[PDB]
Amino acid sequence: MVQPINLIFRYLQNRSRIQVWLYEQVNMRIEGCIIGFDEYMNLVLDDAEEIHSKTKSRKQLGRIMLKGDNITLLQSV
Amino acid sequence: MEQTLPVTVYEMDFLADLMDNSELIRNVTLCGHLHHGKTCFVDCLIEQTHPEIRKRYDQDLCYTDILFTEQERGVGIKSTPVTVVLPDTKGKSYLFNIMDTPGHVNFSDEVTAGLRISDGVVLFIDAAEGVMLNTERLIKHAVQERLAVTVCINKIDRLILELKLPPTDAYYKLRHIVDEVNGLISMYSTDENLILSPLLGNVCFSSSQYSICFTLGSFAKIYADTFGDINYQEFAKRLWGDIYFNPKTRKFTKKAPTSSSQRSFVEFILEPLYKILAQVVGDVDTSLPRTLDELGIHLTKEELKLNIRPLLRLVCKKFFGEFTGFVDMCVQHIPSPKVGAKPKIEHTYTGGVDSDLGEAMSDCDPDGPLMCHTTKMYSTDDGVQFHAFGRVLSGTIHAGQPVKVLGENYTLEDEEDSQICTVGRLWISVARYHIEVNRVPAGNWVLIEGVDQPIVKTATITEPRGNEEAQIFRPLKFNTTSVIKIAVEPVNPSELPKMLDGLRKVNKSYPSLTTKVEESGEHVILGTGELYLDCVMHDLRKMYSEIDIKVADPVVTFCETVVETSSLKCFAETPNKKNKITMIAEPLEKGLAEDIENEVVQITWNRKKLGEFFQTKYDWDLLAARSIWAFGPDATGPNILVDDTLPSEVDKALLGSVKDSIVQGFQWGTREGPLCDELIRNVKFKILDAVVAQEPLHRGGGQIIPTARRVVYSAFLMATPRLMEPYYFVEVQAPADCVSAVYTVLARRRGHVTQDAPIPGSPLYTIKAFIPAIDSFGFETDLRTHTQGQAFSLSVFHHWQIVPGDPLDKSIVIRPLEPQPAPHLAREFMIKTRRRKGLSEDVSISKFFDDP
Amino acid sequence: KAHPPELKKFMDKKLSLKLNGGRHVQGILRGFDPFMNLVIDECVEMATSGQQNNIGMVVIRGNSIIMLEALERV
Amino acid sequence: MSIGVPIKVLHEAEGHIVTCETNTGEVYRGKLIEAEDNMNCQMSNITVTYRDGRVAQLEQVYIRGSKIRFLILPDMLKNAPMLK
Amino acid sequence: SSKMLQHIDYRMRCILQDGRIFIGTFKAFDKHMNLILCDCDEFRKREEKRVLGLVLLRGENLVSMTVEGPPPK
Amino acid sequence: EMTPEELQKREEEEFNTGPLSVLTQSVKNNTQVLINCRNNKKLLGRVKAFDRHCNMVLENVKEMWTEVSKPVNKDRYISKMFLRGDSVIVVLRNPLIA
Amino acid sequence: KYVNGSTYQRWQFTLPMMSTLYRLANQLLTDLVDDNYFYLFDLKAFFTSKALNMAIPGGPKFEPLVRDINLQDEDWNEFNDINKIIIRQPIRTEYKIAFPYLYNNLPHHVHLTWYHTPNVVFIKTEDPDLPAFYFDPLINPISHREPLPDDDEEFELPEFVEPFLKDTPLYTDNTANGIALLWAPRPFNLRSGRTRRALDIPLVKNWYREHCPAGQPVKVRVSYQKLLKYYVLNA
RNA sequence: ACUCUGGUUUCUCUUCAGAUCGCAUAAAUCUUUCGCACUAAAGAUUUCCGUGGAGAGGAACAACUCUGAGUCCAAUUUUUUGAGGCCUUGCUUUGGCAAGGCUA
Numbered sequence A: 001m002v003q004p005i006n007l008i009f010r011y012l013q014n015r016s017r018i019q020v021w022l023y024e025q026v027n028m029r030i031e032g033c034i035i036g037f038d039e040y041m042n043l044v045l046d047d048a049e050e051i052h053s054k055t056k057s058r059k060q061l062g063r064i065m066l067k068g069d070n071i072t073l074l075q076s077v
Numbered sequence B: 001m002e003q004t005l006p007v008t009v010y011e012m013d014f015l016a017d018l019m020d021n022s023e024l025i026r027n028v029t030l031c032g033h034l035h036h037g038k039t040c041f042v043d044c045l046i047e048q049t050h051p052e053i054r055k056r057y058d059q060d061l062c063y064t065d066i067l068f069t070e071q072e073r074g075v076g077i078k079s080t081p082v083t084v085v086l087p088d089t090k091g092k093s094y095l096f097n098i099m100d101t102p103g104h105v106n107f108s109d110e111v112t113a114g115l116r117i118s119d120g121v122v123l124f125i126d127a128a129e130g131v132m133l134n135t136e137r138l139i140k141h142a143v144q145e146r147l148a149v150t151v152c153i154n155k156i157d158r159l160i161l162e163l164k165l166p167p168t169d170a171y172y173k174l175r176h177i178v179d180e181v182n183g184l185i186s187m188y189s190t191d192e193n194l195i196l197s198p199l200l201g202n203v204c205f206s207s208s209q210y211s212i213c214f215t216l217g218s219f220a221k222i223y224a225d226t227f228g229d230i231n232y233q234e235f236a237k238r239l240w241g242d243i244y245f246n247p248k249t250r251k252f253t254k255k256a257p258t259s260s261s262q263r264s265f266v267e268f269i270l271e272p273l274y275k276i277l278a279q280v281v282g283d284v285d286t287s288l289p290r291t292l293d294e295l296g297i298h299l300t301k302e303e304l305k306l307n308i309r310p311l312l313r314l315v316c317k318k319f320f321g322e323f324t325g326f327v328d329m330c331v332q333h334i335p336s337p338k339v340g341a342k343p344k345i346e347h348t349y350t351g352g353v354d355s356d357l358g359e360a361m362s363d364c365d366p367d368g369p370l371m372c373h374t375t376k377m378y379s380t381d382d383g384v385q386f387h388a389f390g391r392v393l394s395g396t397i398h399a400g401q402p403v404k405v406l407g408e409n410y411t412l413e414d415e416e417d418s419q420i421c422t423v424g425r426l427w428i429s430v431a432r433y434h435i436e437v438n439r440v441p442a443g444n445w446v447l448i449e450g451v452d453q454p455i456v457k458t459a460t461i462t463e464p465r466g467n468e469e470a471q472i473f474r475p476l477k478f479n480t481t482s483v484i485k486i487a488v489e490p491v492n493p494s495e496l497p498k499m500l501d502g503l504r505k506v507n508k509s510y511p512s513l514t515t516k517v518e519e520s521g522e523h524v525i526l527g528t529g530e531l532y533l534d535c536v537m538h539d540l541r542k543m544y545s546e547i548d549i550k551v552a553d554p555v556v557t558f559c560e561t562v563v564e565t566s567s568l569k570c571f572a573e574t575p576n577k578k579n580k581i582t583m584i585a586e587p588l589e590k591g592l593a594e595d596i597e598n599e600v601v602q603i604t605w606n607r608k609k610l611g612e613f614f615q616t617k618y619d620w621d622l623l624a625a626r627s628i629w630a631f632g633p634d635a636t637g638p639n640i641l642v643d644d645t646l647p648s649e650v651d652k653a654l655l656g657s658v659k660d661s662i663v664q665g666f667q668w669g670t671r672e673g674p675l676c677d678e679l680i681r682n683v684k685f686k687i688l689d690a691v692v693a694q695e696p697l698h699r700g701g702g703q704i705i706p707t708a709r710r711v712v713y714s715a716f717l718m719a720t721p722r723l724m725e726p727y728y729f730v731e732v733q734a735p736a737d738c739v740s741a742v743y744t745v746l747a748r749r750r751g752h753v754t755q756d757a758p759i760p761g762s763p764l765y766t767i768k769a770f771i772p773a774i775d776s777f778g779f780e781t782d783l784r785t786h787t788q789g790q791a792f793s794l795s796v797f798h799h800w801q802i803v804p805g806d807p808l809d810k811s812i813v814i815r816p817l818e819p820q821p822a823p824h825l826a827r828e829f830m831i832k833t834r835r836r837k838g839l840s841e842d843v844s845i846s847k848f849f850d851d852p
Numbered sequence C: 001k002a003h004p005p006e007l008k009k010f011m012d013k014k015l016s017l018k019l020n021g022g023r024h025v026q027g028i029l030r031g032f033d034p035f036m037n038l039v040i041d042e043c044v045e046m047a048t049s050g051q052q053n054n055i056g057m058v059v060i061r062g063n064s065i066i067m068l069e070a071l072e073r074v
Numbered sequence D: 001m002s003i004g005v006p007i008k009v010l011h012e013a014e015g016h017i018v019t020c021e022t023n024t025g026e027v028y029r030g031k032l033i034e035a036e037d038n039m040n041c042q043m044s045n046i047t048v049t050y051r052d053g054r055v056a057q058l059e060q061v062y063i064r065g066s067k068i069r070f071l072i073l074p075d076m077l078k079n080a081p082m083l084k
Numbered sequence E: 001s002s003k004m005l006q007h008i009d010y011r012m013r014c015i016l017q018d019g020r021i022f023i024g025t026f027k028a029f030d031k032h033m034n035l036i037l038c039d040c041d042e043f044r045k046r047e048e049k050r051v052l053g054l055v056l057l058r059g060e061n062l063v064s065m066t067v068e069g070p071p072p073k
Numbered sequence F: 001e002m003t004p005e006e007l008q009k010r011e012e013e014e015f016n017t018g019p020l021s022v023l024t025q026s027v028k029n030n031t032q033v034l035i036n037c038r039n040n041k042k043l044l045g046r047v048k049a050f051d052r053h054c055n056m057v058l059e060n061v062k063e064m065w066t067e068v069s070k071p072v073n074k075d076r077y078i079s080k081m082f083l084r085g086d087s088v089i090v091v092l093r094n095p096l097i098a
Numbered sequence G: 001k002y003v004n005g006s007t008y009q010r011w012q013f014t015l016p017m018m019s020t021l022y023r024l025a026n027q028l029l030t031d032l033v034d035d036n037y038f039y040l041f042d043l044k045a046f047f048t049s050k051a052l053n054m055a056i057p058g059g060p061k062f063e064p065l066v067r068d069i070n071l072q073d074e075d076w077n078e079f080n081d082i083n084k085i086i087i088r089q090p091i092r093t094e095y096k097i098a099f100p101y102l103y104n105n106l107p108h109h110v111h112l113t114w115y116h117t118p119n120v121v122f123i124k125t126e127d128p129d130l131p132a133f134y135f136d137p138l139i140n141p142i143s144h145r146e147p148l149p150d151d152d153e154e155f156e157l158p159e160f161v162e163p164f165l166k167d168t169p170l171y172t173d174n175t176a177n178g179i180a181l182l183w184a185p186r187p188f189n190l191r192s193g194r195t196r197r198a199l200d201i202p203l204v205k206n207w208y209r210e211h212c213p214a215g216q217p218v219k220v221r222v223s224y225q226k227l228l229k230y231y232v233l234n235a
Numbered sequence H: 001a002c003u004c005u006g007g008u009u010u011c012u013c014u015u016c017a018g019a020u021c022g023c024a025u026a027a028a029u030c031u032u033u034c035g036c037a038c039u040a041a042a043g044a045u046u047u048c049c050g051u052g053g054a055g056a057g058g059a060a061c062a063a064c065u066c067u068g069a070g071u072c073c074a075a076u077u078u079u080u081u082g083a084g085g086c087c088u089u090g091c092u093u094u095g096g097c098a099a100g101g102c103u104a
């Protein structure tokens, strides 16, 4: 049975197109290429980008350290 | 209510509120062998839940065993219910309806009266004695009454303070006990999902002398409250069973490090328990306070001055605390009774689960149609009024509410065994006090006042003006057979009514008691042994009738069998001279009477499955196997009525016209029997031919029932009739040196020793033997006197065996007051029973014919 | 001392998660931590726009999880 | 010294019908199956009142205890032994 | 922490994070300020009183406790 | 934590080298500090002391908060305050004008 | 430390003292670990036998408590019809003491004896050079032969933890002696007690309370039975 | 982790004690029962040997072990924040509240 940070390690082993949702910010999600996590689910993303739902203007961010206290959901593509 | 109840850890409003939520109720029977720790375990639970009720230092408070004969004999005699509120390991309080049942095997019937109203079983096993006679018998009777079985291996201190086993070898002892119980459950149940292991929580380890009680989870929680970061359930999954601890990798391995490491049970559980008991009993003065400081226990200076056994009980009361492993085990592994309502209704209700009332009884709802079921009658100590005890399976009894009590002979077409009785009072029955309640919802046990009059053994209390299609719960199928027969008369005949009154009362108190009057006006009590009938006779002379009562010598009830087919095909015409019946009687195949009695077959089956059984198992043709009419004196009795009437010679519809009366006469004939008016056994009655009258006022009823009994009797007598002896299976627990003494005691009483096997891990032996029950009177007295008390025997009914004589042998002279030799014992056993019965001096084979 | 949330009842079950910002999600549970972050196979997103969006294996932070409903019978 | 009294009352409420309100205003009434030290409540046979007033029937529910505003327990547990 | 063991069984008023009021008999608390209140009536604003019963209020949503009345008999 | 030692003064190595050192500066420099705090308020004062939760004792504070009318910025002066430190957004040493 | 004071009223003893006093009194004590030895030979058994005008063979004989039913004066009812009675073994005196309500018409002032107490399987330790917890050869051997979790599972025991009394030895040099003191007769199962008069201590009361040994002459046998008679009349 | 009780021994008195007051066991008297009463039983009373508890009084040395009381946590799950800002109505106690939509 999969434990979650093992699948985060498998995500960076896959260097997937990880789209991360936000806590309380349902409009803006962030695409990225995941590289590293830690004990507290802080995530660095190589080519991360903001996607709204009303605007949908994907803004490119570069390699970010999105805090663990802000993420909701790590989907792929 | 508001009665004056003792001080308790909970409060009775919380008990009455846990009564409503029937998910938090555990109806539990504590059953085991004699003196295997059940009453002392209930004492430990009572001392846990009652701070003012404390065991004396040198003498164990029993707190059940509330009868005078129980306190004097030391043997539990009646099941005492105890309703406590016990907290779990997680701290959750569950209502516990606990039936402390007698472990003596003669009082096995009392366990059945607890097994009916229970959803689960805690089988108590002496850790020294291991699995004994009544532990095997209550494994069998617990998995056959469809109950969840858990095990409390009580008296583990005997592994420490008596045998002084090493902790590895006492682990081997406990593992052998758990393996023996697993083998017995796999023997008496095809299912293997009820494997008992302490890893599952099914097995609890205990010492009710010293108030030790732990499962693996509750011992792991002592580590979890001592050391914080450990999760105790995962630890409890590793504590038992060939799992070793690696303290360099800190991990539990199946492979043993160092080849001298111990198992996790020995290292983490048994060696701390040994060190606690060894530091108390050996090193109290020198080194008990530093190990007590290591365990977190501080005792007062007044408390360390105690003697070594009360100090052990106190030290383990402070270490182990409450008995939360028992509650772990009975909550995880004994049903809800919401969950346990459906196997209870499927097994014990006569309508089954598929009825409209069986559905509403499987739901177990307190706002349902009232379907209480009482199995025990508890006399108040004035002796006059009884209180029916049982569980509410649906609805709610109320005090003051009129109610419809259905006796055991109530069928839906015979509605006369019912009676509308006003419920007087309701009690939640703890053992030495009763909590008077206004109502009792479903799933709970209740003492009911006022419903005691219309019932003898077993009641189904329903409500009047509804539940018109309400059937009874099944009567208590007992573990054994009440065989020992004593005649009972008053010393002064003028106080016969008191005795008759008292006889009715012992018929209420003892569930497998049979009080009858024979045709000589002789009052007869049937019991399971001499301790059972000694307590019945004590209650008869002291509790119920305050009069003096002569007892006869104990005798046994015999059965009657045949050994060959009947010589001439016997016949009987009715007093009309129409309706000739023509039967032969032949002996049954070997093991078939055991199959009919142990419900391996039923006439409640269809003809296809019944015929398929008798074809594939006993080499019957399907001609004969589809022609079975009935099953002996009851619906499960050891005789068969077959019709081999061809449809060419007999009209089959005209034969099915009188099938009911021929079946009734056959059942009555096998119930009495022509040798000595005691049950016919292991006889196949083949109706060869049957003339039937054409018009129904000439056949049927008063003509064909006594005619069918006469042809059953004559077909039986023309076959070569034999008497059958009840044989007691005797399990003797002797020392190793007293084994040849047990053989010597048994050799004087026609007993054949089956086995003498060492109790593995104890210095004792078990001699399993087969004594005749007519030769077992004072056998345990002979054995314990001859061995100076070192050997001890429990004898329970096993089978019926043919007496070595021939009962129809007028060649045999019997001087009246002599022990007869074996080859004409049956001739002694037949006529004296016939004299006791008062029948004629001899039965001729031609008494029930029509030619003379 | 962080005990794992008691979810082997819900392993391999079809559950509908509610997430923080009025959000919703559906999928098969595959495991957890003591922090109740859930890993999900066959994840269908199910937004409030009304059209159902399959993903597959996702991971959900346990902070954002309001409720589990086991849609499958446990 | 380690575990508090209200979590003991929450463990005492298992099997009973509790009604738990969560952070998003949704009220869940039904049979509390299991509850942990954190207030993670596995409940069952749940009547749900949402914020609008709609009532749904959700037969197996696991609420994360962080989001629980309060639980209304049965008053039977006013006589529970840890509340003495 | 005797500053609220001083307040056990007093009829207390608990203002919450949404602004709702819990007037209940303060039975128990712990280190996380989870309250057990029995016979608790909720007061919200338009005035109405909503009886609840035994409320296990989680400590996250508790702002302020204050006494309404003395402990009953 | 892999540093379970009793003699823990790493928390003011935190306050000399790390991120919170900005306020030990105003413990020692006695500099005016602008605090953007959670109710869209500004607290300018001078922090006397603080530690790891960023709870600060501030002296002689002007606090700014603006109201809608469409926003006019109001002020109130407070003597001296304890500020719970999760109730901040940002903390600012007020800059070198000269 | 060891007694009350100068009044000599209460003593409290160390278990090595009680062990060596138990060993010094070994000749006066029978080393029974039970009262199963006194089955049909205890006080209740003798009160029963006195009440039934029956004599247990090793036991006392009294005057009849009640006037006996003369079994040549009863007049052949249908109850005592000897042609109905199946005789297998003679119903002994012991059976009417053991089950006084089953085997006696008119059991009056009769005492239900204690039944079995479970057989105390205490292995006396012959060798003190043996461990106190030792698989003695009196113990019958246990012939050897489980939902175990996998070793791949990540359950670790934490550093502070080990078994509860790992530093404590399993047995000490006075552990088997204290276990023997558990099964020692009174007063040796005590470690505290109240002081008794030298009159009040019968050194040989539990000698005639045993069965009289084999091979004894008749005068010592009647002496055992009459010591039992006045023991039972006292009690 | 700081402070105030209570002690223990011995001698005596007083009262209660159906509790094995005694893990021991005497004697007297009366009544009953049978013998025909040391060699005999029952019931009851009494006296002795000599207890436990409580209370009280003396006098010997111990006085704070014991029984009590008064006296190291910012990273999901609670207490070191998803917080704050916009729009419509019902009433405005013209401060604004309640519900919903939002935006972050």
Ligand SMILES: Nc1nc2c(ncn2[C@@H]2O[C@H](COP(=O)(O)OP(=O)(O)OP(=O)(O)O)[C@@H](O)[C@H]2O)c(=O)[nH]1
Pocket (backbone or CB within 6 Å): B033, B034, B035, B036, B037, B038, B039, B040, B041, B060, B062, B074, B075, B076, B077, B101, B102, B103, B104, B154, B155, B156, B157, B158, B206, B207, B208, B209, B210, G117, G118
């Ligand atoms: N050594 C030891 N003896 C025990 C233990 N538990 C009970 N006993 C003793 O064993 C005897 C068993 O008596 P009970 O437990 O009361 O009787 P029971 O087990 O309920 O069986 P029944 O007599 O049929 O009711 C008692 O005399 C207890 O003193 C124990 O854990 N260890």
Ligand SMILES: [Mg+2]
Pocket (backbone or CB within 6 Å): B038, B039, B065, B075, B076, B100, B101, B102, B103
């Ligand atoms: Mg019992």
